[PDB]
């Protein structure tokens, strides 16, 4: 049944192609623009002028856009706009797009970035976090889109461009953690993820991942560290030199100011990626 | 659906609204929502004779649910307490009875469109955790942990109610330091000699009492007490802006040891310390009065 | 809901009690269920011969979605099976008045660092991590002609039973490595990650599956007594990925152990 939607998608993307580009186009990676990346947007070449459409046009897509065109030579897709399981959407309309794109048999790789608090203590604000693993929380309770996720010759890849750009940001490696959100996390919740294993915590990517590994892409992750999770204890009522509760707590605002401020960073290692995938 | 659900708040509050205008000769505004939990429910003796208060049934104020308990079916208490005006929540949705998060914590989103309350005091019983807390021992919660939320069921899921509050909550700053120093102050002021803790509470759906193997998951999680409610009411009072205070009582230690193996010469009995639904009411009712005086002390202050 | 689930319990024992009353010359009064789980359906051969047994077709049964086996096993009558529905066929069984045992098999991953591929975990303690969350086979008006609103489960796993399964090792003379352990309930896959594993193992789990504790928590709300044994098929890698810097001897042996435990019940 949820089929059918992912054929006409598939039909609609493909005949928008069809009309749209003098040549074929077949997009060798989907680019899911995570918080902040939605400016690699400038990246595209103008010239074969890309299509965009909007989700609004495409069966299915429950505003965002999705972006053809050509990244430093090689044909891509940009996912501009994501959807997340805290807005109320099943995990199987989060990942819609992708299986309506696999339907074009040319993707086979996914470029997925997001904004992520740090959990790692000696994570900061502004450093870059490549995923190697994941914790699925919700998947633990059965909340799933539909074995090793993330490509090791990627994660080089993006290693040795950081190189050779000479990108002096902080690139971390480790384990992201996916949590339902849309609150940011207690002293005790970031305590505890803490000694789960979790790196990096946020609220999205996971499902995608797992279902381009499902349609047989390889994946690269990139985390931008937006934020240091609070973990110290809070200020006790017997403290007579309290730290104020509030202090260091998450906003929205600091998110979006730092992933905005690694954008720069983030956008040129995926254009140079993009061309050796 | 959110519209669906504006709709109903709207309708709960002018309800609300017209029967407190109707009731009352002075414009009721209470000034905090008092949530009783388990075994609790004395503290609406504290609500005094004149003015007249207004209890409003759940069975009769739009698009709240009845608790499946009987004949436990709830109810709203406006009126004075120490000559403050508050509301009580006699009564609460509990997750585990078939509610959604939503239902459960419709109550404090249709209360907060009166525009007076700034502070929600939030009581329930919970089982100890930590090693060093005792049955009857009080917990005043500074912080939580929400693992349902983390795994997919939390109060604000679905589109957010931009009128009430941000998208994107921080919860490092749940839990008010002043109203956790006022609650101790008040202890000292009436000389009650009951313990009271601080420390991290954890909600679980329930409504099974916690297995050995998960209390231990829990302890090592970070719990200090664990219950089948409060953090969602917290989430969504914190969401439209007020201030929380949240205690807890300690009405049984949680059993964390490993059950007896098949290799024990003089084996502990499984079910020797099990929880039961009968000793936490017990225990519940010898700290009532405690818990009662502390909140009719406190609300006359904030 | 409640209303008629609990019809639906009433019309699923009414059509087995009624088939059994048919089959049998006797009456059948089980006093055990055998849930037998991914692997080892072999203990359907042991039953009993005489009387020759009672087969009921999921499909057939009220409200059910496999197959229901009525028969003696070792001497034993007993039923064989092969979320408040999956649990459904419990409750109905249950009204037979008889049943006071489950016996509950699975195919695990290991996540205990002892633990090796073939051996087996006697389950002696669980965690039901979505319960904790909000699945959980007793969300709902509680069926109060079952068992408590709030039922303990610090008592789940019965020590008798687990001393019985290991002394039926030692007289079967089966050399098959025996864990006694914790039994994490999941929703996730057997694609779960190396971080996964490793936070299942450092939250306490010795075994990992997607079944059993739904049931055992439904049998003892219903009263029952429990016991759970783990086939353990695998060792779950906790290990971290590379750095970019850089057999049915098992499932026989379950019948045996199963065939004579269930005699001295
Ligand atoms: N859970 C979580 N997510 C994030 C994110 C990632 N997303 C950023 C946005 C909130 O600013 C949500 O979609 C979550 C950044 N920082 C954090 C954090 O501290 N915690
Ligand atoms: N999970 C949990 N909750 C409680 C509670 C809180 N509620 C009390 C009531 C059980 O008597 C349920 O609503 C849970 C008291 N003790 C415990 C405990 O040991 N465990």
Not at 65 to 90: C, K
Not at 172 to 198: D, I
């Amino acid at each position: 049944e949820q089929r059918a939607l992912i054929k006409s998608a598939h039909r609609y993307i493909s005949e928008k192609l069809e009309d749209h580009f003098s040549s074929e186009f077949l997009p060798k990676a989907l680019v899911i623009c995570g918080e902040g990346l939605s400016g690699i947007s400038t990246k595209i070449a103008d010239e074969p002028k890309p299509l965009i459409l909007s989700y609004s046009t495409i069966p299915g897509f429950k505003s965002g856009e999705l972006i053809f065109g050509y990244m430093n030579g090689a044909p891509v897709v940009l996912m501009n706009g994501r959807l997340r399981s805290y807005e109320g959407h099943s995990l199987a309309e989060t990942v819609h797009p992708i299986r309506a794109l696999h339907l074009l048999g040319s993707i086979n790789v996914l470029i997925v970035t997001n904004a992520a608090g740090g959990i790692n203590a000696s994570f900061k604000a502004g450093d870059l976090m490549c995923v190697y693993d994941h914790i699925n929380f919700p998947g633990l309770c059965g909340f799933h889109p539909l074995s090793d996720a993330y490509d090791l010759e990627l994660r080089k890849l993006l290693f040795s461009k950081k190189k050779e750009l000479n990108i002096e940001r902080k690139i971390h490696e480790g384990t992201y953690s996916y949590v339902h959100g849309p609150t940011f996390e207690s002293r005790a919740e970031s305590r505890f993820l803490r000694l789960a294993g979790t790196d990096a915590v946020g609220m999205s990517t996971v499902p995608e991942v797992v279902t381009a590994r499902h349609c047989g892409w390889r994946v690269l992750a990139l985390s931008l560290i937006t934020n240091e999770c609070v973990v110290d204890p809070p200020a006790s009522a017997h403290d007579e030199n309290p730290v104020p509760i509030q202090e260091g707590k998450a906003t929205h605002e600091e998110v979006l100011e730092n992933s905005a401020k690694a954008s720069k960073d983030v956008q040129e290692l995926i254009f140079s990626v993009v061309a050796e995938i």
